[model samples]
Target: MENFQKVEKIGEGTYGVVYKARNKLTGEVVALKKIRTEGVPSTAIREISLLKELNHPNIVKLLDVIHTENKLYLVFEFLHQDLKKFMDASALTGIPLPLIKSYLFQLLQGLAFCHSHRVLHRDLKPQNLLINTEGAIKLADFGLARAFGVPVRTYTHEVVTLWYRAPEILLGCKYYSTAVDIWSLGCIFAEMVTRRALFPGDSEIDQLFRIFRTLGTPDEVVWPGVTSMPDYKPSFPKWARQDFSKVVPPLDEDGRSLLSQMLHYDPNKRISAKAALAHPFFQDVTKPVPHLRL
Candidate 1:
């Protein structure tokens, strides 16, 4: 504990406390995810194994792990802040276009890797995306992640934040897929350009309502078997989809066009992270991201 004593800046996690520490004279900072219990948590185990298996530039780095008599510490390479704070810092200007493209591409690349490995990052929000001094974003926090298509509604539907949660999940669809993250990416992309949540909601019902208000209500025509889900309701209010250009007015045509592809009502029809990496919105992102592998 002496080595990690200088710890005022921290993130209080549900599982444990994350301390931002610099234990070396060179100021080599690190994150220590200290577990709360004497015994290990299952979520930590899964997260550790997953992090051990997945090694990419955009995925947060798990450097080491330590166990004391009372606690377990998951060590990670230090990052400066989460995307939420980063965005909030520039709330007035929103994220610049180049940074947006860079971060989104990095996120999708990591997401594509997860999808390829059949892992679903069930919770993908700004708070879980970490940024560093080098202007890079890394996907963090896998507490709710699970293998794709696995049926385990064990946790409350608090998996993804309401705003970024997919319509299928809102309608009680249990078959988790890569499409879930795609919807989130679309929402995040729009938020980056507009500096506002695409669908800010207070509750699940309100979240669904907000989404419907912006993107038109789903139906059998647009999303097959729409009325069959457990949460489906015939009395639900409807609205027409708004133009993406107007919704995120600053975005160019290709990015706006690409937005809807990820925001498709049907999970099956939603664009893949890999395919989105090929979209025209990223064509101008030709300038190299400092440490990006791609």
Candidate 2:
């Protein structure tokens, strides 16, 4: 436990400061995320508990958990940059299409694994998708995650970033499903291609309409009980189909098709992680990703 030494700061997480730590015992480089112990039993421990159970290359690996001098530390594999940084860099120097495909496939792979365990990654975005030196996508951050199930009980809708949030959520739909994550994935996919937020709504009503305008208005036929949602309401100017090519101009045919599937307006019809992985878009994809042995 004392063998690990913090070398430098990695980045800020939802609840703690992450750092690169070297394990003196094995000389393995790992990221040490430290969360203050002053708060109840430690949120870091909660993160550790979940990370220990979940294991996937696409998901950030949590190797160990240690407590030193009353400070909780979670050890994870170190990554050099994140998707956000990669996209920022890409803007300066154009990013290749194949690379974007690799990132999305890897993210879905990790997310598929998470969904298998009934864990909802409440906060997912470019910043949370880390890229190691080898350039693989590793999903980080589980601080806001919670177990969701089919009964679809109501819970606090207090999750997800504004731009990445699903329309069902904006409508105050309490009974949610894995489709929520799929919506965020669609948003991420769009952002990856364009290097900007796909939907930057000024308000809740605006956000809902932004989605309505692009995807077409959701009718009761499309989303049963749509009007039953707590905050459901119709938007101005009945929804009309917008041009996808113009909306996400940077995406190619296959890419736009995939994005359209992911961005399905009806939560029930939103593409599943498993089906999305098998999409033809990734058929011949080849791009460097960390730890993927040829």
Candidate 3:
């Protein structure tokens, strides 16, 4: 406790309170997450275990773990701001297109690494994405993440934020995969271009309808085995598929095409993070700048 000096409370998350702190020895700033030891949360355990196996530049680095009398502290590399805060604080009407592509590309690259390791980041909203002054974006907050290598029957449908959740999950698919993360990336991409959430539904049902209203209602023909899900229900609110350009006017043809693939109603049909990286949308993106200012 004496080794680091607490700066201030940065934010609160599912498990505990997060703080910005400075290491007294090295004078390095870092984010410290304090978790109560009263029956340690499963998410906390999962985060610790999964993070130990993950070592990537795009993912948040879990530097060290400290245990006290009745609490646990998770030390992470400090980041200046989060994607949500960055976008909200921006003076531009929307994030510049170059920054948008670079951020999204980094996001997918991180996701590809995660998926390759057979881990699923169940929650991937902008609020969970950290941004540093070096123009590097890292994925954080693994409280909702879980390993998906083996199917031992613990996955749930109530994962991810409503607006960024995939339609198949909304329709009650219990055994989902990496596709959910891609769906979130799609929503985030749109939000970056428009400075607003694509589907800000107030409820789970409302969220489903918002997706259906845009992508058109899915059926067994389009999404095979969708009707067989445990929570599947019949409905009659048919909507024609909307044009991607109408929703994201600032996106060009390649960008819109990639977004559509990521936001597909059928999880099976959704583009994989690796495949998305290879899409034409990123063709002109030679290399990420040393530092992005948007």
Candidate 4:
């Protein structure tokens, strides 16, 4: 939060600019994002305010917010590695058991913190989670996403990753809520111990089938409102659901139960992060912190 000199523009447009710059005070480098002085600083600027409300150890901290006539810059604490970086590297070998529990606890605690504050991450994927040298994982990339909607139809890219998407989104549910994050959490939970991609679907249709393969084809019986979904069709494949054992082989019974709640077919039934913190699965896990005490 000094007179940081702008080194170079990594990339942007009539939209806000993302620049690479060094802090004059300590010669440290940080990502500086500038938002246009558009009439209403609705999205990205709103993130600056939202991030300010959170001081949790798990969520990334906003370093500073600088305002200028032409451009307004938001500085955030920088972390080089995302969760995928570590997962991919560690994946070359094995996923240690205690670390899985430890990491999972951190994510759950962080998300639970958000739920308490009445905010939604909206985007939840391994790549969006960050880890630093001290061994604590942080929820990151605040609202860099919302800033991209200026030219909404510029591209056909899927806004959120298919793998972490909730069943409600796939079924074309009009209004969604906190339950979306829970489903993604469940996917990540399964992925951690198995060291495999959960619901690794390339397309929207394929993603649903992959999920149904493990969870079975849902109906009005299992999920009362599912048949009313915008995308639901009678012709959809009917596969009997298998237990979590097959998909998440190494997870213990307690973990399976937690996973089941997170992945519940009905968003209404999906476990809230706050409730999940009290799940029996966490009995042995220590407090969520940067370092794994276990």
C-alpha local distance difference test of each model: 0.77, 0.74, 0.78, 0.75
lDDT preference between candidates 3 and 4, better one: 3
Clashing pairs in 4: none
Point to the candidate with the largest lDDT: 3
Clashing pairs in 2: 136-290
List the lowest-lDDT window of 10 residues for candidate 1.
147-156
| lDDT of each residue in 1-294, candidate 3, tens digit only | 688776689877545678999999999998987754465555555556557667888999878766566667888888878888878876365667888898999899999998898877876889889987777899985423452121122223223357777777777777779999999889999999888899988777899889888888778788888777766777647778888879898789999999999987778899999999999999876434434353
Ranking of candidates on TM-score, top first: 3, 1, 4, 2
Supply the global lDDT for candidate 2.
0.74
Best by TM-score: 3
Give Cα distance to truth, residue 130, candidate 1, Å. 1.7
Candidate 4 residue runs with Cα over 4 Å from true position: 1-21, 26-28, 33-44, 65-73, 142-160, 287-294
Candidate ranking under lDDT, highest first, comes to 3, 1, 4, 2
> RMSD in angstroms, all models?
4.7, 5.4, 4.6, 4.3
Residues 43-92, model 4: lDDT tens digits: 65556565666778988776777766645677767676667767777776
Error of 2 at 139 (Å): 1.1
Q: Which is superior by TM-score, 1 or 2? A: 1
